[PDB]
Scaffold this active site. Structure first.
Site, PDB file in Angstrom:
ATOM      1  CG  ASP A  48      -0.190  -3.724   2.396  1.00 18.72           C
ATOM      2  OD1 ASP A  48       0.483  -3.619   1.630  1.00 18.72           O
ATOM      3  OD2 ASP A  48      -0.465  -3.589   3.823  1.00 18.72           O
ATOM      4  CB  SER A  78       2.485   3.050   6.503  1.00 20.15           C
ATOM      5  OG  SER A  78       1.319   3.064   6.020  1.00 20.15           O
ATOM      6  CG  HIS A 112       0.184   0.589   2.543  1.00 16.56           C
ATOM      7  ND1 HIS A 112      -0.176  -0.451   3.294  1.00 16.56           N
ATOM      8  CD2 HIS A 112      -0.525   1.718   2.627  1.00 16.56           C
ATOM      9  CE1 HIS A 112       0.323   0.606   3.967  1.00 16.56           C
ATOM     10  NE2 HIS A 112       0.711   1.467   4.132  1.00 16.56           N
TER      11      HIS A 112
END
Ligand SMILES: CC(C)C[C@@H](NS(=O)(=O)Cc1ccccc1)C(=O)N1CCC[C@H]1C(=O)NCc1ccc(C(=N)N)cc1
Ligand SMILES: *[C@@H]1O[C@H](CO)[C@@H](O)[C@H](O)[C@H]1NC(C)=O
Ligand code: NA
Ligand code: NA
Lengths: 28, 11, 251
Positions: free
Chosen positions: C99, C198, C43
């Protein structure tokens, strides 16, 4: 890769960081 | 907010 | 990172910053797994709902960093991307299943006191350490609270949570390719990853061989450090066959 996960400023000189013991203590 | 990086890396 | 603390110098020498060229800004965390391969969250590179689709030339990787914003002359090394590989079954439509992404550097990075790769877990280390209650460590330059930004790399240690508690904390469908971590409301202590963290690593130090292993990748969470919510992490070992396949054919 042979040397992966061993930090020059910690494991490689047998010094512990300030909180790694918290991790070890949780591995029961 | 970020300090500029040497131009060599943006070339 | 919310409710963490300043990292020590060289505490996380595998930590990588993904940096946008224009405008110059933090895009994500990531980790160094060899002299030419960097691991991150899919992502960080691809998320169509927010019109995110980065290409190799959009990005730089900055390795060996401590300060978030400074150019750390003589310490950090900045690398260009040769190629990005996103998991072909990355589920951005639903729940960020799988992910994970790899990035191959144009040139090998030189290891130093501040730059050193993390291990990826074998089946046995994964089975031994990925247990409820066992703590790992998350690091990043992301937000200090949900709703500011740190001067230097932040660190927090967090316990892995039982799968049913993870599932019962959210309406999102959880998969075997994710795990969650964080303190329960009753436990008093707190802390979480957040926006900007992230793609960074969730690591554990093996008590069997004293090496650091990357068990997780910061993936998603509902807000940051909310009571009764947990941080979700990509299960690195579950996706290791894909990792090896990519490195074996392109490396
Ligand atoms: C499954 C997904 C749709 C949930 C979504 N939740 S979200 O609240 O928007 C994430 C967020 C964005 C900005 C500020 C705070 C928190 C989310 O986490 N997303 C949507 C797309 C990418 C990913 C993300 O932002 N990841 C960064 C992240 C944020 C928080 C945490 C955490 N552990 N609390 C982890 C990663
Ligand atoms: C993202 O960008 C690439 C390259 O420009 C493009 O081919 C692709 O279709 C876009 N969307 C993806 C990969 O989901
Ligand atoms: Na649920
Ligand atoms: Na929480």
């Amino acid at each position: 890769e042979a040397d992966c996960g061993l930090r020059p400023l910690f494991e490689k000189k047998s010094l512990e960081d300030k909180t790694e013991r918290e991790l070890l203590e949780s591995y029961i | 907010d970020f300090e500029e990086i040497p131009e060599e890396y943006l070339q | 990172i919310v409710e963490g603390s300043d990292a020590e110098i060289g505490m996380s020498p595998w930590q990588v910053m993904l940096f946008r060229k224009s405008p110059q800004e933090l895009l994500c965390g990531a980790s160094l797994i060899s002299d030419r391969w960097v691991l991150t969250a899919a992502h960080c590179l691809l998320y169509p709902p927010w019109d995110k689709n980065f290409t190799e030339n959009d990005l730089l990787v900055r390795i060996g960093k401590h300060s978030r914003t400074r150019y750390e002359r003589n310490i950090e090394k900045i690398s260009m991307l040769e190629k990005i590989y996103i998991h072909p079954r990355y589920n951005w439509r639903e729940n960020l299943d799988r992910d994970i992404a790899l990035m191959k550097l144009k040139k090998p990075v030189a290891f130093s006191d501040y730059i050193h790769p993390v291990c990826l877990p074998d089946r046995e280390t994964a089975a031994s350490l990925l247990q409820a209650g066992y703590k790992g460590r998350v690091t990043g330059w992301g937000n200090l609270k949900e709703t500011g930004q740190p001067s230097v790399l932040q660190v927090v240690n967090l316990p892995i949570v039982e799968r049913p508690v993870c599932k019962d904390s959210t309406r999102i469908r959880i998969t075997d390719n994710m795990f969650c971590a964080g303190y329960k409301p009753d436990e008093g202590k707190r802390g979480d990853a957040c926006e900007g963290d992230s793609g960074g690593p969730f690591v554990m130090k093996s008590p069997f061989n004293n090496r650091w292993y990357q068990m997780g990748i910061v993936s998603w969470g509902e807000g940051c450090d909310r009571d009764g919510k947990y941080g979700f992490y990509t299960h690195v070992f579950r996706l290791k066959k894909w990792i090896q396949k990519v490195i074996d054919q392109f490396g």
